[PDB]
Design a protein around this ligand. Structure first.
Ligand SMILES: O=C(O)[C@@]1(O)C[C@@H](O)[C@@H](O)[C@@H]([C@H](O)CO)O1
Ligand SMILES: [Mg+2]
Ligand SMILES: [Mg+2]
Ligand SMILES: [Mg+2]
Ligand SMILES: [Zn+2]
Lengths: 225, 218
């Protein structure tokens, strides 16, 4: 199994620096070019840089948008890819992906980015890291039966992202997690879950919330009331 | 500069129907040495990383359903989906790799389905929030179609406009419906001045607003 895992994203002030990393396994690292691609929220993918394989002497290339400011590098001993980012600007806010690029020396050579990481998010801003408040959404009244909808409100955090799961991911069907909305330098998001009436409140339903930038971990049980 | 452009920016197609989308390069991507077009297509579903569908313009990546076909050469390329499935909802990007790499701006594919009325739920502020002096009222509008919808908040019968924040999910990959959340935020002091809180949903599936409410007193 080819595995690529980005790390290092977070909140950085304008003008500041940040180095992203990408851990790889499951293939011969030095055989492959590696690329970084980013995607600002709601916008197109943008290729930024690559570093060639061993046969090519690990040389580098960059898009004009980042040349002179970013440096791509690799550690071949542990199979890591890096992106050093300097002189950051708001327009650099985005999810950053690492992707396995070509091996031109292989007889099976095809020219594509065939494997991609889950991506790591970067926010370039002067605003303050703020952890979320997490509130339960329980019904005040309901008809005599059937399905019941609950939720969690994840209010007042910065920067993106948060993760929300329900019963540690074991409730996945019937979940809606709404995209966060920014108002006054703080984000708010909500998540709803819909389960059969016969299972709640008789069985527990809990939302699990994480806010990486503040290392927040919250479990909130939804109690009738 | 190799400039990549795609068309349409967005469209909607019913399940089972054919979809065609286009990609142009500002220069030919045909390597006369290799005889290959350095053009690839990527699929990005809501909240997922990009996935490789097609490379060399027409070679399907292993694992990709054969309803996906890439074609074209030179500066003009096409991705065709026969019998679109609900799971195919995504943004599709083409990308040249003739000279470094450059992505097009993407085509957003949505799915057309039968109209569906929203299921609407209203939630009062939690005791934990009120303890801290704030009061958020939340209304979920789930599983509706088309996307176009209006929510009105009424407090004690009158409309309240400021303090409202709205958010729509992407289309669902299974049932091709949409959902929306509306949150009205007040101070606890303002919340306690009034009794009736009402979320009113206006959707084409009915001529009367769907109305859900609760009373603070009760
Ligand atoms: O820059 C390169 O090393 C590379 O091999 C990348 C390939 O994707 C392709 O662009 C190739 C050119 O076709 C070489 O002319 O250059
Ligand atoms: Mg393959
Ligand atoms: Mg749904
Ligand atoms: Mg008032
Ligand atoms: Zn070079």
């Amino acid at each position: 199994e080819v595995k690529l895992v980005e790390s290092g994203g977070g909140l950085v002030q304008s003008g500041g620096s940040l180095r992203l990393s990408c851990a790889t396994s499951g293939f011969t690292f030095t055989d492959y070019y590696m690329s970084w691609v980013r995607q600002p929220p709601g916008k197109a993918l943008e290729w930024l840089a690559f570093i060639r394989n061993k046969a090519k002497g690990y040389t580098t290339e960059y898009s004009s948008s980042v040349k002179g400011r970013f440096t791509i590098s690799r550690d071949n001993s542990q199979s890591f890819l890096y992106l050093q980012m300097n002189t950051l600007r708001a327009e650099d806010s985005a999810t950053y992906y690492c992707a396995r690029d070509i091996n031109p020396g292989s007889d099976g050579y095809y020219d594509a980015l065939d494997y991609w990481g889950q991506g790591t998010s970067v926010t370039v801003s002067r605003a303050k890291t703020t952890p979320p408040s997490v509130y339960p959404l329980a019904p005040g009244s309901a008809a005599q039966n059937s399905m019941v909808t609950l939720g969690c409100l994840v209010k007042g955090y910065f920067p993106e992202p948060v993760t929300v799961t329900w019963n540690s991911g074991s409730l996945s069907s019937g979940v809606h997690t709404f995209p966060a909305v920014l108002q006054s330098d703080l984000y708010t998001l909500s998540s709803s879950v819909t389960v059969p009436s016969s299972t709640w409140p008789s069985e527990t339903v809990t939302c699990n919330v994480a806010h990486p930038a503040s290392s927040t971990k919250v479990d909130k049980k939804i109690v009738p009331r | 500069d190799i400039v990549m452009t795609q068309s349409p920016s967005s469209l909607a197609v019913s399940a089972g129907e054919k979809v065609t989308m286009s990609c142009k390069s500002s220069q030919s991507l045909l390597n006369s040495r290799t005889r290959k077009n350095y053009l690839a297509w990527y699929q990005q579903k809501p909240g997922q990383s990009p996935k490789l569908l097609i490379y060399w313009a027409s070679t399907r990546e292993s694992g990709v359903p054969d309803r996906f076909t890439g074609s074209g050469s030179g500066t003009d390329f096409t991705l065709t989906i026969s019998s679109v499935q609900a799971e195919d909802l995504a943004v599709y990007y083409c990308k040249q790799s003739y000279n470094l790499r450059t992505f097009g701006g993407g085509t957003k594919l949505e799915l057309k389905r039968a109209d569906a009325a929203p299921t609407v739920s209203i939630f009062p502020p939690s005791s934990e929030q009120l303890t801290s002096g704030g009061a958020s009222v939340v209304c979920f509008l789930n599983n509706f179609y088309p996307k176009s919808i209006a929510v009105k908040w009424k407090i004690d019968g009158s409309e309240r406009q400021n303090g409202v924040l709205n958010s729509w999910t992407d289309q669902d990959k299974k049932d091709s419906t949409y959902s929306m959340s509306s949150t009205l935020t007040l101070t606890k002091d303002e919340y306690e001045r009034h009794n009736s809180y009402t979320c009113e949903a206006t959707h084409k599936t009915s001529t009367s607003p769907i109305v859900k409410s609760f009373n603070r007193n009760e």
